[PDB]
Design a protein around this ligand. Sequence first.
Ligand SMILES: Cc1ncc(COP(=O)(O)O)c(CN[C@@H](CO)C(=O)O)c1O
Ligand SMILES: Cc1ncc(COP(=O)(O)O)c(CN[C@@H](CO)C(=O)O)c1O
Ligand code: NA
Ligand code: NA
Lengths: 253, 253, 394, 394
Amino acid sequence: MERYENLFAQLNDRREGAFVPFVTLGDPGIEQSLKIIDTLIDAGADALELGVPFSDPLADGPTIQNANLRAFAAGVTPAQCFEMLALIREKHPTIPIGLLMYANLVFNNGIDAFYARCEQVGVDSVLVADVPVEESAPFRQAALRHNIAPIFICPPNADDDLLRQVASYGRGYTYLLPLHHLIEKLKEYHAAPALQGFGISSPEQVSAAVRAGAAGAISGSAIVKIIEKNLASPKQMLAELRSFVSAMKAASR
Amino acid sequence: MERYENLFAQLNDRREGAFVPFVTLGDPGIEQSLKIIDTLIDAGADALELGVPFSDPLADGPTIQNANLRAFAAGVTPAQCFEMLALIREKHPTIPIGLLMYANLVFNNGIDAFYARCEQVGVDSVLVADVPVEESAPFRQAALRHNIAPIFICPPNADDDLLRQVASYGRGYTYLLPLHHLIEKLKEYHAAPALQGFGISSPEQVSAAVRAGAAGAISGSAIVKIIEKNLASPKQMLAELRSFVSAMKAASR
Amino acid sequence: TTLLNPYFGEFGGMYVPQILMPALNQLEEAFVSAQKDPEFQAQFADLLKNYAGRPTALTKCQNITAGTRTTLYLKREDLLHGGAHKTNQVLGQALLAKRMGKSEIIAETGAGQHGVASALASALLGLKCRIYMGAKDVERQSPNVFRMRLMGAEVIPVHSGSATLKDACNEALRDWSGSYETAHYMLGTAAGPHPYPTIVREFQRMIGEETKAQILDKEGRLPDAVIACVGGGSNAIGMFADFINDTSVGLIGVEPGGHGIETGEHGAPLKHGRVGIYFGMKAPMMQTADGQIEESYSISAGLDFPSVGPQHAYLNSIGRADYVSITDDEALEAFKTLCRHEGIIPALESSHALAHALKMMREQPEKEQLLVVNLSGRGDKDIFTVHDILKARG
Amino acid sequence: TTLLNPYFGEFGGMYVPQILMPALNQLEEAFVSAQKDPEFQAQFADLLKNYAGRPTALTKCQNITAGTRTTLYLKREDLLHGGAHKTNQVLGQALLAKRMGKSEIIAETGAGQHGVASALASALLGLKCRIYMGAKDVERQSPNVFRMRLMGAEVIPVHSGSATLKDACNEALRDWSGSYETAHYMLGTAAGPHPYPTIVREFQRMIGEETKAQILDKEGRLPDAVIACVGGGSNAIGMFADFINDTSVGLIGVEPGGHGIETGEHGAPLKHGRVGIYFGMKAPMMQTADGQIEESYSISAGLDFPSVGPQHAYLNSIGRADYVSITDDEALEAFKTLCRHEGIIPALESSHALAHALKMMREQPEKEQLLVVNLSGRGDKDIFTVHDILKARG
Ligand SMILES: Cc1ncc(COP(=O)(O)O)c(CN[C@@H](CO)C(=O)O)c1O
Ligand SMILES: Cc1ncc(COP(=O)(O)O)c(CN[C@@H](CO)C(=O)O)c1O
Ligand code: NA
Ligand code: NA
C-alpha cells in the first residue's frame, strides 16, 4: 500500500499520470522475464502489474492466454514467481508492484498465508480477477492485515451501489475498465486513485485518460504483444519494449 | 401323367422300384447339363425331376442353392430351361419328366399358360415347392387341364386330413418325405404311388424304401453333389454319375 | 383350414412348403387365444409401458409449417426403447413365443433395427435368439451387428443369392422349417405368410390407437390424413389400422422412389412392381420380366424389403389408402429440415413420410389441413450416411 | 445481494469477474420470477411431455437381481428425446432465456451430449446457438459435433489450455462476459457460479419427483437408496432433490474411479480432490499441489468435469449423501451385464451407477433392499469404445 500513496503523491506534484505496464511473470522464461521487467522500469514504468501463470485464466483474452502457455512451457510455477518478485524488489525498492492473481492460487495454501508471502517478498497490491466485491471479504481482510492493497475492477456496467463498495473496499488504486462521470463519483466517494485500463495501447490514450481525471493508465496487453512478436530476437524485444514504454510514459507528462 | 402310369405298371410287372434322380437344369451350363441328363438316363434313371433355377429357393438346402448359382452364372433362364426340356423329350419319348418349380415362376405369365407350355414341351408332372395343398387349387386345376400331374409332398409331420387331401389331389406320384404307416394310409386312400424322397444317397436306402412299400426312391441332392465335386473334369463327372446311378438302379431290382 | 382369413382380397395367403403349415397353424391358434386372454394383454401392456416407454408423444411441429395453413403433428415412435417402432411387435411376438412354450427365436433383419429389437426382447424375456442378415448388410451395419451381439444374440450372415434381406428371409424360413417345435420365427414386418400380416398389424396398432386419442385431445377432431413410410408395411399398418373405419381420414403410405421411378432404381413395388408369389404371400414385388425376385434400392437401408404387406396392396386396390413415392434427395431434404427447424433427427426411412407431408404443405400452402406423420425411428444411425453424401457434394 | 442463498454450507458462491455479476443477478431474478409464473411452468411442462417424452419409465430389472433379495428399478432417462437427462434442463434454460428476451445461447460440452441438447432446444425454440468444445473433445466426438451442426448450431473448438471441457468452460464464460445482453450461457451441469447449481437442480428435479410417484405406485413405499453417477452433479441432484427430506432413503453418488484412485488417474474430486475456487465456485477439484486445475480421467467421456457441484459437496459434508467411486473395468462389466440380461444398452456414465448397485447386491446377496439407479443416458454412443476395448483384450 504505502508505495502507491508515495507514488501518486509524487506524480501529483509533477502533475503527471502514472503509466503501468502489465506482463506475465516468467514469459517467455525467467531470465528473459527479469530482463523485460528491468527494461520496463528503466524505460519509465511508474508501477508494475505482474501476472502469475495459472491453468485456467477465465478472465483473460487470447494475448494473455498465450503468455501463460509460454510461461508454462518454461516450467514456471507460483513458487518461482515469488522468487522472481523477491529479486525484483531487492533491485527496485520504491516502484509499487501489483499482482494479477486467480483466486485458486491465492486460496490454495490458505488465503492469509498467500498475503503473508506477498508482504515478505515486497508486493504492494493484488487484484484477484475472479473475486467480485460480493465475495471479497476474506481476501480484502487478509490483504489489509499484511499491508497489501486489495484492488478492484470498476466495470463499465457499474452502478452506484458498486461504486460505493469499490471506493470503500479498494486501496492503492481503482482499476477502471461515462468515463468522466465514473471518475467523478469515485472521487466523490474518496476511492483509491483511478487507473484506466483496457484498450490502452498508444500514447494518445494515455493523455486522454489523464485529461478525463484518472491518475494514470494501465496497458493490459500491449506489452505482451510486443513480447509475442519478438520471441526470435530477445535483443529486438527489449529495444521495442523500451521504445514503447518511453513513449507511453512521455505521454503522461 | 400317362407316362407315370405306364412306368409304374411296367416296374410292378418286373417287381422293381423306380429310381429318380434330381438335377438343376442348366447346371453347370446348358450343354453340360444336357449331357449329364443323357447320362443319368443311359445309366438307368427311371424318371427325372428337374429344377428350374429361381432367385430365392426358400425350400432348398445348400447343395441345391449352389446349383442355382452355378446355373445363373451360366446365364440360364426359364425360357432356356423350356428349350432344354423340349430337346430332352424329343430324345427320350417315354421317360416321365417332372419339374420342381417355385410358385412365382409358374404364376408369372399366368398359371394356365405355364401348364400349357409344359404340356407343349412334353413334361409329365410339376411339384410347386411353396404351394401347400391349402393353396393349390388353381395350380392343380390348370395342371389337370393340360394333362400334367400335380405332385404333392407328404411331410413327416402329416396328419390324417392331409393324407387324405394329398391322396385325392395328387397324381403321377406322391413325394414322400411312421414310414411303413404313411405308406399304408396312402395306399388305403388310393394315392398316387409313393416315392421316398430326401436323404436318399446310397443303394441300401433304395432297397429299404421299396421294402417299406414305396414305389421307388428319389435322390434329391446326391447327384447334385457329384456335379459340384467334379466341376474341373466334365469327363470324370459323367463317369461318376453313371456309376452312381447304375448302382442305385441296381438296388431297386 | 384356418381360424382367420389369410387373404386381403386377392393378396396374402400361405405360400410356404407343406412342412411349415403346422407351424403357421399353431402360431395362428396361439395368437387367437392370446388376443382373448386378459392376462396376456396385461403383460404386453406392462412391457410396452414400463420397458418400452409407451405411449409415445404426439409432437406438434409449428416452425416447419410457418406461413402455411398445414398443422403437422409427428407421432414419436423414435422415442420408443430401441429408437423405432419395431420394438412394439417384438415384445408381442416374444410373449407369444413363450405362450407356445418356445425358448428360441429366429429373426431376419436388413438395416438391423428389427434384429436389435428381437435381440433386446429376447435378452429381456430369456429366449435364445439367432438372427439372420445378408452378408452385404452385415458389412454395412457393423454397429447394429455389434449391439445385437452385446445383447446375447447369435448373428448369422447369409451369403446365398443377393446376400441381402430377401436372402436372410429365405434362410430364416429354412431354419424355422426344421425347428418350429422349440423356436419361433419373429418376422419383422407386416408381410410373409398368414398369420404374420395380421399378427404384426395387431401388435403395432397401438400406434394409431394412441394417435387418435392424442389428436382428439389436442385438436378435438381426427386428422385429414395420416402419413407413413412403407418398406414391408408394419409402421404404416400400425398407424393406419384404427383409422380404416374413419372414412374422412386419409391414409397415405410412402414407398422409396430411390434415384427416381424412371431409373428403375427404387423400392416401390406397390405402385411400380408386379404381383407375384414369394416370401409366403401373393403381393406386388420387385421382379424381373421372367419372375426372378430383385432388390429394392433406397438411400434408406430399412426400406429394402422388395415387396409389400398384402393388407397395403388390398387397401390400395379398393381405394381406401393412397400410396406415393419420394426420392432419395427429397428424403434427404426432409431429414435436414426436421433437424434444423424442430431439433429432431429422423430415421431416413421416416424422412420419406415427412418429405411427402412437406410436399402436401408446400404445393398448396393455403389449404387448411391437419396432417400426422408417423416418425417411425430416430436417425442417429443415419448421420454417417448423410455426412458422406453431404461430403461428396460439398 | 441476491434473492437466493448462493452457498450450500461453505461451497458454491459467485467467484466470477465483476463484469459478469449483473448477468448472474439478472438470471437469478428471471429464474425466481419464472418459478412463480404459472404460465412458464405450463409451457415447460408442455415441452417436457409433448416434445421430450416425460414422464420416463421406471423399469424393474428382474433378471439381473435373480437369486438375491435386491429389487432394482432403473429410472429411464435414456428414453428422453436426445438419449440423456440433459434435455430436461436445456428446455428450462432456453425458456428462461426467452423470458429474459435473449435470442442467442452459448453452451459448453465435453462428451457432446449437453452440446446436442442445447442445439436441439435452440432449433426448437428459435435461438441462435453457439457451442464451445475442447479441440481434443471435438476430435473424438465427430458424430456429436455433426448432429450439433445439422441442428443449426455453431460449434467452436477451443485449443487453449488442455483443449478439453474446462477450457471450453472458460471460453464460454469469456464470451458471455461480453454478450450477456442478448445471449444466455446455458451451463450443462449443476455447478458453476450461483445461480446455476440451483437452476439446474430445479430443472432436473422432475427426475426424482417422478421416481418417488412411480416407486410408491409400484412398491408402496420409498426406495432404500437411489444411486446416480456424478460428473458435474446434475442427473444425480435431479434424482436426489425430492428425496433429501425423506430421511430413510439413502442417496449415493458415484464418481469415476478411472484406472483406480491409487493411480491418480480418476475423476473423483469430491472424495479424493481438494477444495479450490474455479469455474465460479468453491468446491472440491482435481488440482495440482500448487493449485493448477487438472483434467478428470474416465473411460466415460461424460464424467470429465474436473470438479463437482457445490450442493453434492455440502450433502456429503453433513452426511446426508454418500459418495463412492467405480473404476473403468467395473463400469464396463455393468455395461455388458445390462445389455445381456435386460436388453438395455446404458451410457458408460450411467454404467458407473449400475456397477455400484450391482456391488451392493452381490456383496450382500441376502440383504433385502429396494434400489433405483438413475439410467442417465443410452449407450449407443459408447459402442465403438466398448468394441475397441473388447478388441484390445480379446
Ligand atoms: C426406422 C424404420 N422405419 C421403417 C422401417 C420399414 O419397415 P416397415 O415398413 O415394416 O415399417 C424400418 C425397417 N427396417 C427393417 C428392414 O430393413 C429391419 O430389419 O430393420 C425401420 O427400421
Ligand atoms: C449420459 C450422461 N450421463 C451423465 C453425465 C454427467 O453429468 P452430470 O453429472 O451433470 O449428470 C453426462 C455428462 N456429459 C457432459 C459433460 O461431458 C456433456 O457436455 O455432454 C452424460 O452425458
Ligand atoms: Na417394400
Ligand atoms: Na466431476
